[PDB]
């Protein structure tokens, strides 16, 4: 699973089966890292109009 | 793939299904790859 974003700590209480999370657009918003099983939130990097 | 979903609920109703809502979490996924059209419940006898 590929993508770009800032990985931060999260407070979303994922259930044991649950691995990733999806927004309305279906783009991945949170992910569970292998090897260490922790839950990393994925926040898109800051952008806007010049 | 044999998907088993499970949920354990404390109830106190005597005879029928209690009326309420409880979403079943996934328990296990088994790669059995076999044809299934019929199934059986297994019970346990009590002997004295
Ligand atoms: C390796 O990944 C497994 C998950 O499949 C995990 O249980 C285990 O702790 C990991 N070990 C190391 C050394 O990262």
Curated annotation (Swiss-Prot), chain A:
Outcome (variant: residue 25 to D): In strain: Alpha/B.1.1.7
Superkingdom of source: Viruses
Quaternary structure and partners: Binds to host ACE2. RBD also interacts with the N-linked glycan on 'Asn-90' of ACE2. Cleavage of S generates a polybasic C-terminal sequence on S1 that binds to host Neuropilin-1 (NRP1) and Neuropilin-2 (NRP2) receptors. Interacts with host integrin alpha-5/beta-1 (ITGA5:ITGB1) and with ACE2 in complex with integrin alpha-5/beta-1 (ITGA5:ITGB1). May interact via cytoplasmic c-terminus with M protein. May interact (via N-terminus) with host bilirubin and biliverdin, thereby preventing antibody binding to the SARS-CoV-2 spike NTD via an allosteric mechanism.
Role noted for this protein: Attaches the virion to the cell membrane by interacting with host receptor, initiating the infection. The major receptor is host ACE2. When S2/S2' has been cleaved, binding to the receptor triggers direct fusion at the cell membrane. When S2/S2' has not been cleaved, binding to the receptor results in internalization of the virus by endocytosis using host TFRC and GRM2 and leading to fusion of the virion membrane with the host endosomal membrane. Alternatively, may use NRP1/NRP2 and integrin as entry receptors.
Protein name in UniProt: Spike protein S1
Organism: Severe acute respiratory syndrome coronavirus 2 (2019-nCoV)
Shown stretch of the complete protein: 546 to 595 of 1273
